[PDB]
């Protein structure tokens, strides 16, 4: 009943990471819940596009922090011993809750 929560900027990277996570959980076979679609947080910024003066001209930027949680509920000894070093992705933020 532990939950693994994952944050990323690239949804393709986080989906491939959680796909390898569920593939390593299911490569032998276990009762494992898939990743949940926890909502993406959007940081939006409107800043001025000219150095001196603007009236209508501003540029608009957005950061989408995509959020997943896989919630491993089934204990498997090989999964616990080797659920590290699977994705090898440097853009993925990992947290553990219970």
């Amino acid at each position: 009943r532990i939950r693994i929560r994952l944050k990323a900027f690239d949804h393709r990277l986080i989906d491939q990471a959680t796909a390898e996570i569920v593939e390593t959980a299911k490569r032998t076979g276990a009762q494992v819940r898939g990743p949940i679609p926890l909502p993406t947080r959007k940081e939006r910024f409107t800043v001025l596009i000219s150095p001196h003066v603007n009236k209508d001209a501003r540029d608009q930027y957005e950061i989408r922090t995509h959020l997943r949680l896989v919630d491993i509920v089934e204990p498997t000894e090989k999964t616990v011993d080797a659920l590290m070093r699977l994705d090898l992705a440097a853009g993925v933020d990992v947290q553990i809750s219970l």
């Binding site: 940081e43 910024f45 800043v47 001025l48 540029d59 608009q60 930027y61 957005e62 950061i63 853009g91």
Partner: protein, 96 residues
């Protein structure tokens, strides 16, 4: 290049880091009523440059005090330039 301005800013950051957070959290606790004094005549002796209100959030690329953003720590022009260069991760140009 406002290096005088930036040196003033980093000097007051260093002085505020030296004279803050050693007794600053106890200021309200000593001053406030627990549910004049020698303690409050000592408390009204603190200097003026040690406060964090002395600081201004300036850019770190340029030192420009206007147009600042806390998340990037940069002025608006250099936020735009780094976003268009790709040096800021995840800052795709919004289009909704």
């Amino acid at each position: 290049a406002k290096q005088s301005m930036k040196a003033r800013e980093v000097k007051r950051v260093a002085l505020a880091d030296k004279y803050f957070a050693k007794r600053a959290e106890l200021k309200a606790i000593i001053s406030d009523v627990n549910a004049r004094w020698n303690a409050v005549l000592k408390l009204q002796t603190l200097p003026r440059d040690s406060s964090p209100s002395r600081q201004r959030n300036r850019c770190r690329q340029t030192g420009r005090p206007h147009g600042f953003l806390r998340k990037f720590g940069l002025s608006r022009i250099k936020v735009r330039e780094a976003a268009m260069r790709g040096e800021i991760p995840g800052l795709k140009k919004a289009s909704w």
